[PDB]
Write a structure and sequence with these properties.
The chain has about 190 residues and is mainly beta. The strands form 4 sheets. Strands 5, 6, 7, 8 and 9 form a 5-stranded antiparallel β-sheet that branches. It has a 4-stranded antiparallel β-sheet with strand order 1-2-3-4. Strands 10-11-12-13 form a 4-stranded antiparallel β-sheet. The protein starts with 10 loop residues before the first strand and ends with a helix. It binds chloride ion and sodium ion (2 copies). The site of one sodium ion (NA) has 11 residues, from strand 1, strand 5, strand 10 and strand 14. Chloride ion binds next to strand 1, strand 5, strand 10 and strand 14.
């Protein structure tokens, strides 16, 4: 289906360079103001060389800007358009302490994995899990995808999303308020 169908998403990543990718079922959506065809539905198998649906994605903030895609117990690492050699790997081999079948991830060098009501911090070692709702104020303990900007993170749940200020770690006050339509207020779909 197309970007503006209103259906929930499976994953997002901000490449931290002006471009980002959304994932839903078998489809990958490149979202960049520089794109000749922004939001053109392409097959994940065609762009990333793997079968959808994926569970989570993130892109590291460092120089190399590697993209990580998660599905089940496995992850794939990409750079410069291409799957790195020695991928896929088991999550346990790259991310000790992080569970399988995650719901979401984001990168600020701190990475956060989300699964049910809990999240895990990873630094390039893992800690005890904490509660999403305790540390991300106004975010319920159920997220489908996440992505990190410069001053905000976004949490996606069904057909709606939340924006959280990174300083306050609280959902921002806007009008109409969060949670609100991904299609209408985040993608700027008709
Ligand atoms: Cl995600
Ligand atoms: Na997800
Ligand atoms: Na993400």
């Amino acid at each position: 289906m197309e970007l503006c169908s209103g259906k929930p998403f499976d994953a997002f990543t901000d490449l931290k360079n002006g471009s980002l990718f959304a994932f839903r079922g078998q489809y990958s959506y490149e979202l960049d103001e520089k794109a000749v065809r922004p939001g053109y539905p392409k097959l994940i198998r065609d762009v990333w060389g793997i079968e959808g649906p994926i569970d989570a994605a993130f892109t590291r903030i460092n120089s190399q800007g590697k993209t990580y895609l998660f599905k089940g117990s496995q992850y794939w690492r990409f750079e410069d358009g291409v799957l790195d050699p020695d991928y896929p790997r088991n999550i346990s081999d790259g991310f000790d302490g992080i569970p399988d079948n995650v719901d979401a991830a984001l990168a600020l060098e701190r990475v956060y994995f989300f699964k049910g009501k809990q999240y895990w911090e990873y630094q390039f070692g893992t800690r005890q899990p904490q509660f999403i709702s305790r540390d991300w104020h106004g975010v319920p303990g159920q997220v489908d995808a996440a992505m990190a900007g410069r001053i905000s993170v976004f949490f996606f749940s069904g057909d709606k999303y939340y924006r959280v200020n990174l300083r306050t770690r609280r959902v921002d006050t806007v009008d109409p308020p969060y949670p609100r339509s991904i299609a209408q207020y985040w993608l700027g779909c008709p």
